[PDB]
Design a protein around this ligand. Structure first.
Ligand SMILES: Cc1ccc(C2CC2)c(-c2ccc3c(c2)CCCO3)c1[C@H](OC(C)(C)C)C(=O)O
Ligand SMILES: Cc1ccc(C2CC2)c(-c2ccc3c(c2)CCCO3)c1[C@H](OC(C)(C)C)C(=O)O
Ligand SMILES: [Cl-]
Ligand SMILES: [Mg+2]
Ligand SMILES: [Mg+2]
Lengths: 50, 142, 141, 51
C-alpha cells in the first residue's frame, strides 16, 4: 500500500492515506480529515521492500 | 536472527560516526555523516538495505532514529524498527582501533574506514566471513 | 570468474557524479554520488568497499581518478590489484534506467540512486544479485 | 610485511617509492632511479596491511 508524508511547519507529517495524485495537488486523508496538499509538499511512498 | 542490526552514533574530533552492526556476526559498516540528523540516518539505512537483508534495526531513542525520514526509509525498504549492548561495546572497540591508526591518515573518515576493515577482517572466522556465511546459509536452506 | 573481481566506473546524471562498483560474477552493485570525480573520493570509496567484501582485483578504464596516486595507496594498503582497460558499462545503463523509473519518488538524485541499487540487487531472475554474491563468497571461504 | 612511500615536493602526491631508511625527521626513498630525502611530515609510509 501507499503512505503519504506531507508538510504544512517544516516537520514531515503522516503517514496519510493516498486518495488522488494530481499534477499540482494531492488529495489525502489523515486521521479522518480530508486534506489537499501541493505536490511539492507531498512524498508518496510505496512499501516496495514489503 | 540473520536480519537483525543495531545502529548508533559515536563522536570523534567533533564529527559524527554512524555505525551499523550485524548482531549475529559482529560485522560493521560506518560513515562519517555531516550532521546527526534523521535525513542523514535515512540515507545511510537505504544504502545498508541495498547490500544486506535488513529486517530489523534496533536503536536507542535518539531523535535522528525516531525521525519521520527514518520511518519513511524503513517503510519503503521493509525494515521493522525497535527501540531501547552490542553496538555500544562496538563503538568503544572502533574508537580504540581508530586511535591506534589515526596518525597514518590525514582525515578522520579515512581512519574510520581503516578501522572498519581491520575489525571486519580480523580472524577461525572473521566477522566479514561470518556475516556472509550466516546469510548464505539462510538462503541456501530456504 | 574469480569471486574477488570487481569493476568500477563513473556515470553522470543531473550534473552529478555517480561512482559505481559491480561484482562481476554476481551482478551485485554498490554506488555513491560523490562531490567531485577525483582520486581522493575514489580512494575513499574503495577503502569502504574493501572493508565489506573480499576485494582482490579492481578493473577500471584509464580515467584520471582511477590512475591517481591516492587510489594506488588505497589499493596497496587494502591488498587490491588494479587492472586497466563491458559489464560495468552495461550496468551503468541499467542503473540509469531504474533511476529514471523511480526518479519522481525522491527529491534528491542520491536517494533515487540508492533506491535503484536496492531494486537491482533484490530482483530475482532464480537468485537475485544480492543472493548470488553472498552465495559465491561464502562457498569460496 | 612490505612498505611503500607516498610523498610531496607540488601538491600532487608522488609514489609509490621504495623505503630506504626512516630517520626521526626525514625518510630516504628511491622513486624509480632518483634517491630523495623527504621530511617526515611530507611522507606517508604505507604497509600492505590487506596482504
Ligand atoms: C588526504 C590523503 C592524501 C594522500 C593519500 C595517499 C598518499 C597517497 C591519502 C591516503 C589514501 C589511501 C590510504 C591512506 C591515505 C592511508 C592508508 C589507507 O589508504 C589521503 C587520505 O584521504 C583519502 C580521502 C583516503 C584520499 C588520508 O586521510 O590521509
Ligand atoms: C528529502 C526527503 C524528505 C523527506 C523524506 C520522507 C517523507 C519523509 C525523504 C525520503 C526518505 C526515505 C525514502 C524516500 C524519501 C523515498 C523512498 C525511499 O525512502 C527525503 C529523501 O531524502 C533523504 C536524504 C533520503 C532523507 C528524498 O530525497 O526525497
Ligand atoms: Cl632524520
Ligand atoms: Mg546513541
Ligand atoms: Mg569511465
Amino acid at each position: 500500500n501507499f503512505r503519504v508524508y506531507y508538510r504544512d511547519d517544516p516537520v514531515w507529517k503522516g503517514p496519510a492515506k493516498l486518495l488522488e495524485k494530481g499534477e499540482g495537488a494531492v488529495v489525502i486523508q489523515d486521521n479522518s480529515d480530508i486534506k489537499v496538499v501541493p505536490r511539492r509538499k507531498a512524498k508518496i511512498i510505496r512499501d516496495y521492500g514489503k
